[PDB]
Scaffold this active site. Structure first.
Site, PDB file in Angstrom:
ATOM      1  N   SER A 136     -38.914  36.044 -12.206  1.00 38.80           N
ATOM      2  CA  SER A 136     -40.223  35.702 -12.818  1.00 38.80           C
ATOM      3  C   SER A 136     -40.615  34.272 -12.411  1.00 38.80           C
ATOM      4  CB  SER A 136     -40.161  35.928 -14.326  1.00 38.80           C
ATOM      5  OG  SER A 136     -41.471  35.975 -14.879  1.00 38.80           O
ATOM      6  N   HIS A 166     -39.236  44.222 -17.497  1.00 36.92           N
ATOM      7  CA  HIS A 166     -39.122  42.805 -17.057  1.00 36.92           C
ATOM      8  C   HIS A 166     -37.738  42.240 -17.364  1.00 36.92           C
ATOM      9  CE1 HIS A 166     -41.155  39.091 -15.872  1.00 36.92           C
ATOM     10  NE2 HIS A 166     -40.560  38.478 -16.936  1.00 36.92           N
ATOM     11  N   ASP A 187     -43.282  46.931 -16.229  1.00 32.21           N
ATOM     12  CA  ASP A 187     -43.320  45.493 -16.607  1.00 32.21           C
ATOM     13  C   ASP A 187     -44.647  45.166 -17.294  1.00 32.21           C
ATOM     14  OD1 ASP A 187     -43.478  42.640 -16.554  1.00 32.21           O
ATOM     15  OD2 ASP A 187     -42.041  42.643 -14.879  1.00 32.21           O
TER      16      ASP A 187
END
Lengths: 278, 276
Positions: A148, A257, A224
């Protein structure tokens, strides 16, 4: 540059260790974790994979939850996991999960009050690697990866430093920070409003003007929650078409995620780096 | 039942469920890993995992790295909570008593007898619930860590026909004779040791008639080894009737999920062999 062991856990015949040290670059005390594989104790100097973690993370999350030590031990790769920001009572902060501590965005902050401590770029590219080499059985061969905010940093660092890294991978990276909310808030705070210096810290801008190529592997979860708003993997796909950059980007159906996604594909990422490190 | 969260994992599904427990008279959380073969129409066998002091259902699911080989071998894994939870439930602010510290017993002493039937929860209520709500066979094994290890061996030794195999990491081997065990057993069952004998892995193993194949790993650099875990009593207890116990001291390994993770593959293959 003072450093001291904090902890030691044996892991798949090798060693997970935490150290604190005095960072000159970040002007504060930092915690990182290293995994040394079994081949580190058998005379061989091993390559290093640097792992950059995402928002809210410390070094602990990757080491405890990613499940990477098993394949690092079998393949003979040291893993280094820095923290995500300077730490300490003097260090600028923002109550927001998306800004300040846990959120250094792997940039060299030029604006006050951030410029006092937030040089997470220089720390990950310059200080930390020199400290690791002087202290541990690691070769000169290094690669970089992350999740991320950490995927943003890994891609930016590899694209700005193609000589110094053999490969780069990323899970759920922030592909285009100059045009997403997380990106805009943090680059505004740290670099100044609009400011052309943003373009030094955006994977998809850098990948477009890129000369020297670092093999890149990107995994993104279909399910996600941040895919559309924050991560914009399709902008990274389009960045690679301009020069024909060596980007493999995979959309994984039903994956979110979380570390459940990362743990599911970390083997493949480790083999990809072992290939280019070997 | 209510699905609280879902995360794809190694082609299968990590899931958190809350339900209303009649045996614990509270709202409970457990986690299940369902491997790919669960969504291929084949009923999979189940490994119950019992966690240690202070844990929830999340510790093993996030730290043990068991999903890769569960997905490979086709084993479903259920992680109960370590105690009842909710503001209706009796607590002690000590870490080694009340919430996070069930010791996998049925309490008879106040205030504990109202909520603290984690023996009954794990042996009866949760497996009936898993088998009615999930595509799983009636084949099961049990494994655990520390308090969970004590719980795993005690449950397996007392329900030999229900469990194909039992393993443990750093079990509380001889709870009638360690501080953790005496405090919990005294609080949950009262001060008379006679009622404790049915909750001691070492005492049950020494009298065992029915064998359940058993694998134990113990880190030799474990800070709780000497005072609390007492693996030497479990070795001694196996010599009495010839119990099929494999017990390993692992050099330099500690109490942490770094130790568990390092050997969980050997445990999943041990359990696969007996569940098949």
């Amino acid at each position: 540059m003072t450093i001291e062991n904090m902890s030691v856990n044996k892991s798949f015949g090798g060693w997970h260790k935490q150290y604190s040290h005095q960072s000159q670059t970040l002007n504060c005390e930092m915690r990182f974790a290293i995994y040394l594989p079994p081949q580190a104790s058998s005379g061989k100097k091993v390559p290093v994979l640097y792992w950059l973690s995402g928002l809210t993370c410390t070094d602990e999350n990757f080491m405890q939850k990613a499940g990477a030590q098993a394949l690092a031990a079998e393949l003979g790769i040291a893993i280094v996991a820095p923290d995500t920001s300077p730490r300490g009572e003097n260090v600028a902060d923002d109550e927001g999960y998306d800004l300040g501590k846990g959120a250094g965005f792997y940039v060299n902050a030029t604006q006050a009050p951030w410029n006092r401590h937030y040089r997470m770029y220089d720390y990950v590219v310059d200080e930390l690697p020199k400290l690791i080499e002087s202290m541990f059985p690691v070769s000169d061969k290094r690669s970089i990866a992350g999740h991320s905010m950490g995927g943003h940093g890994a891609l930016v660092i590899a694209l700005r430093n193609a000589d110094a890294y053999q490969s780069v991978s990323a899970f759920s990276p922030i592909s285009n920070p100059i045009n997403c909310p997380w990106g805009k808030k943090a680059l505004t705070a740290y670099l100044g409003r609009d400011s052309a210096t943003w373009m030094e810290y955006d994977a998809s801008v850098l990948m477009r003007q890129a000369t020297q190529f670092v093999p890149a592997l990107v995994d993104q979860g279909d399910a996600d929650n941040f895919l559309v708003e924050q991560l914009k993997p399709e902008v990274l796909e389009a960045a690679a078409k301009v020069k024909g950059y060596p980007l493999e980007l995979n959309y994984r159906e039903g994956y979110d995620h979380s570390y459940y996604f990362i743990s599911s594909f970390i083997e493949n990422h480790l083999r990809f780096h072992a290939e280019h490190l070997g």
